[PDB]
Amino acid sequence: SMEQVAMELRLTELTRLLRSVLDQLQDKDPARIFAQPVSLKEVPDYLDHIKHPMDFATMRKRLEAQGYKNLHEFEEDFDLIIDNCMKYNARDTVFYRAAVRLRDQGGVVLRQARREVDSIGLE
Numbered sequence: 001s002m003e004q005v006a007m008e009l010r011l012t013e014l015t016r017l018l019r020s021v022l023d024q025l026q027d028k029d030p031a032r033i034f035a036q037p038v039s040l041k042e043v044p045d046y047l048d049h050i051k052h053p054m055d056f057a058t059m060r061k062r063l064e065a066q067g068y069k070n071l072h073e074f075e076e077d078f079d080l081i082i083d084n085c086m087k088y089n090a091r092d093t094v095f096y097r098a099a100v101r102l103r104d105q106g107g108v109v110l111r112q113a114r115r116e117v118d119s120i121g122l123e
């Protein structure tokens with residue numbers, strides 16, 4: 001149907017916007033601490049601590065499968081990256097501190113993304 005095509009066009013446009021957002025967020029992680037899943041080889045007990053691991057590569061895979069239906073779903077995954085890190089690592093670590101900085105600098109990007117998704121009507 002034409003309605004289904006229209007819905008699919010909206011999803012494609014949301015995906016385009018979210019791709020730009022993801023690139024901007026990842027730029028705020030220059031050390032690439034959050035680029036890939038936490039290695040169970042360097043951190044073998046990780047899954048005993050963290051029940052829903054997340055990272056930028058995993059988000060990008062979901063994104064390109066058009067697996068984010070709205071901005072909220074995308075933000076949920078971004079918040080997992082930060083929140084997982086601030087639980088597993090102590091405040092005096094380069095990991096925790098990278099998550100704080102990513103959260104802070106990311107908030108700015110996400111604030112304007114919410115305005116764009118709303119005003120253009122992408123969900």
Ligand SMILES: Cn1c(=O)ccc2cc([N+](=O)[O-])c(Br)cc21
Nearest residue numbers: 033038042043084085088089095
């Ligand atoms: C425990 N842990 C986190 O919580 C978040 C990121 C992270 C990255 C690496 N890394 O190598 O990039 C390692 Br070993 C551990 C990490």
